[PDB]
Amino acid sequence: IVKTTTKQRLDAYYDLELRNSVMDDILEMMPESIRQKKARTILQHLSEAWRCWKANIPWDVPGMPAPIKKIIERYIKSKADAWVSAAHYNRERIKRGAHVEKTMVKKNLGRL
Amino acid sequence: IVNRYEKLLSQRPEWHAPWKLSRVINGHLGWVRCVAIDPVDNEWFITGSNDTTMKVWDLATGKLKTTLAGHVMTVRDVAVSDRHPYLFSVSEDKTVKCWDLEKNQIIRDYYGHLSGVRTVSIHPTLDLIATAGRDSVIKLWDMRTRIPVITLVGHKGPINQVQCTPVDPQVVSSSTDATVRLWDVVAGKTMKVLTHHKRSVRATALHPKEFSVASACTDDIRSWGLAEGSLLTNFESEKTGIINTLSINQDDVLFAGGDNGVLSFYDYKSGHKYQSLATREMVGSLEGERSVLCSTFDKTGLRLITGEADKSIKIWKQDETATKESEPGLAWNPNLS
Amino acid sequence: EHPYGKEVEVLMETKNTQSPQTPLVEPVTERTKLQEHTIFTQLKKNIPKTRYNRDYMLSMANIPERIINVGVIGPLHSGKTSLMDLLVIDSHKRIPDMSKNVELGWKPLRYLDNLKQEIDRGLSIKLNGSTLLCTD
Amino acid sequence: PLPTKAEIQECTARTKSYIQRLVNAKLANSNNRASSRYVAPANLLLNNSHHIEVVSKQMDPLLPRFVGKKARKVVAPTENDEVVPVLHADPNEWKIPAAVSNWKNPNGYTENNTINDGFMKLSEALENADKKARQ
Amino acid sequence: MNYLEGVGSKKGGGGIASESQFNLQRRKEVESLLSKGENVPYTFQDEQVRSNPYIYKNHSGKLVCKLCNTMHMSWSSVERHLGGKKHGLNVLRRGISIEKSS
Amino acid sequence: TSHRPQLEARSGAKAAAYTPTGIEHARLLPGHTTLKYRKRSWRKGTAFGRGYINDMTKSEYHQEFLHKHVR
Amino acid sequence: PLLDILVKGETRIQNRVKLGLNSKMPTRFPPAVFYTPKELGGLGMISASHILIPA
């Protein structure tokens, strides 16, 4: 029973693909030996950084290897672009009068 | 043995011309994940994207023709058929969709992947498709009946890339377990396993003529002869990692795009690196956004198209002046181990 | 602009050219179909065979007094085109455009009304003749 | 070398023949009289003594076909063939911090630049122009 | 169709709890913070090295310094005492009193 | 922590059948069965009288958006 | 356009009540149910939307 991606479970899948996509790069950068606890920790830096992007807070960190920071900033700019573009698309869809459901409005106005 | 390595200075490999940037096409709202070109006429190319669309770009003028919607998540890989008027696209939404080009609409969905599918390869002679993804398997689809006929079990990790070849091994696959496997599809089992890579293998390209395959990893770009499966050459690389994309020109030119933005051209026969460039990112971008996520050569082989993480397509043209006035490349030093 | 700046064309592309309906790979068709405009026979092997032997007709073409050119005129639906349809079927041995229905009786065959408009419009638009020999 | 023309015409045929065996068998398995329109003694007993003829009896079209078929899970043992050889400062540079979020503390684990001359110049003009007007 | 609203309830029991119950919860957590999580042991429990080692809890609930024989109402008071000049002295006196014998 | 997703082979080695159990889905019904092969006092009186940035948020199209719908 | 939008609005609210129970049947919901003033126990909604609209 492989379940398709639909409206309700879209953004959960977006999360999952993003997290995998970041672990791939950062694990392919680092030299070798130890990952898994380190693997878990890197993702917490990601999500924290996204929260910082939404709040317009800069997200500097004390000593962190620059390349990892490059990676995280790259993916957060991707996610930010998708987030903004959906914010606009749903908004014109609401304006012209088409049916936008309910929590997509309540969710939209937060984005805007 | 080193007496031969004394003679290994007698080859002095194959001068080639330098590559430069001809044109830059903006127009994509996300990253540009994948690029495929019309295999017959070199008239236009197709472009996967983060923003879920596909755009058909006119190749001669770089103008835009039409946009193709239809996926809800990013489009990771794209293939256009030599023998059919079909476009096969694949996404992270677990779906493999055909696109009939004549009418420009969706035709056939192929169902039954567990999770996101990052690669599509069209078998040259059989009217099959090969797709693979985070599911760690390859599925061979009957193109007509949309049946997952053959499932090749194998890699212990997500499969990055899939290729098709007319004779034995018909399926070459490269996963993140650092194994390039060569498949026998009729017996459904692996013909040969190529383990020499240290880390995940994120790119593989097939040579248009020689019948061999190139693989890539962080620091290492190898080649492999098919049939036997032997190692053939190595490609000299300082730490260029991460190698996202490989492409092979008809002229034994081998392009390897990086995640650092550095484009690295090689000579396929020797394993020599005759150039290195760096893209000029964009007006308002970040140094993080300078990189290369895909690539191809058109059928002529004189123009390279690489979509980049800055939401731009860049068409890299080969210089007409060239020769040895001042080409000379990085100049052949065979260092030792 | 300048980051490339000289030999490079940076072009920003929105909208579209080439309206979305265009095939982008055009349907490849060898045969040339005339069936939209007219219903016509384009292959020599399919021309209806004539009992009266055409080459004997070509002999009559020389003698000026032998041939007469006669057009048929009249008001609506007087039978002009269906009159011609008598002479032709009597002249030719087999016709490919005869259905078993128009042969039998029910539907008049109309040889002269070749155009698809004339078939649909139920009418004669453009004049169309035939050249056939017939004995008094 | 390239595979060659006479060889590629071979494996193309033998695979294409094989796949049809899978497509045909798979279409004719599932429940469709509709979709199935797209579709040997075999045994010398042991030492061959008796010989054999095998014939598959026709099942009743109402009763469940594949009466033994029921969907069940199976854990698969590992394949026989074995042992493919693998053939292959910065620790302080690549040492990652520990993530601490302002917005969550689950479970355990407890500006520079100055102003412009624009502001300097504007306020004088308002301070001067006012004193002049107040005189 | 009242699903339009978006509130709900779990089907278990009777929710809010009683203002008195909140205080008990809040005065335990406040004494967990200021205490920095240490378990200050009871006086009768027959001794996990203590952060200090003098503070305890008597058979009643109060906190006591066993050097100074003072009784304290809360952790906040104790940190006043541990930062006091009397609890300074009694350490020095025990300092000398040990340095004169072994 | 998705970590290791799910491998296909364990789902591909199940003893249901080659096909699924035999459930007949509505999108696997035969469709597109055939392939396709390629070949002047008033004027005087007054006192005052007479590039594409790469980003979504700092772009020119974006300010126009919040210039309208945020009113 | 204002008149058109009135006709949509008023029917959309009446539909709000109807879908609120479970019917679109005209027979169940005679106009007295929507239009009687609240003092007699209706909704007392005030109808500007019957009219006839110039076309």
Added chain:
RNA sequence: AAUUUUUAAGGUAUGUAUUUUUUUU
């Protein structure tokens, strides 16, 4: 110059044990 009628689901959990004729020292 003419509309159009209704059934399910997201609300009252879920889980465990319970009627048994005494397996040979």
Added chain:
RNA sequence: GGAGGUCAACAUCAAGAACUGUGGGCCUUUGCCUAUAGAACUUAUAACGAACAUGGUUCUUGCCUUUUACCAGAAC
């Protein structure tokens, strides 16, 4: 041997107005030209059916808390 069968199998039934076979000629059998034999069934206010249902995908809509079930037009 004929008349039949609410018998069966196999082949065929939307295409340059549209089929095959044959002899000869150019090519050197595909293909082109020419002569000739035979063409049941279905077609022109277009079609096996003087009849008329349902589903799928993608678009544009209608009801509008969400899915099923649905409104009604199009293409495939």
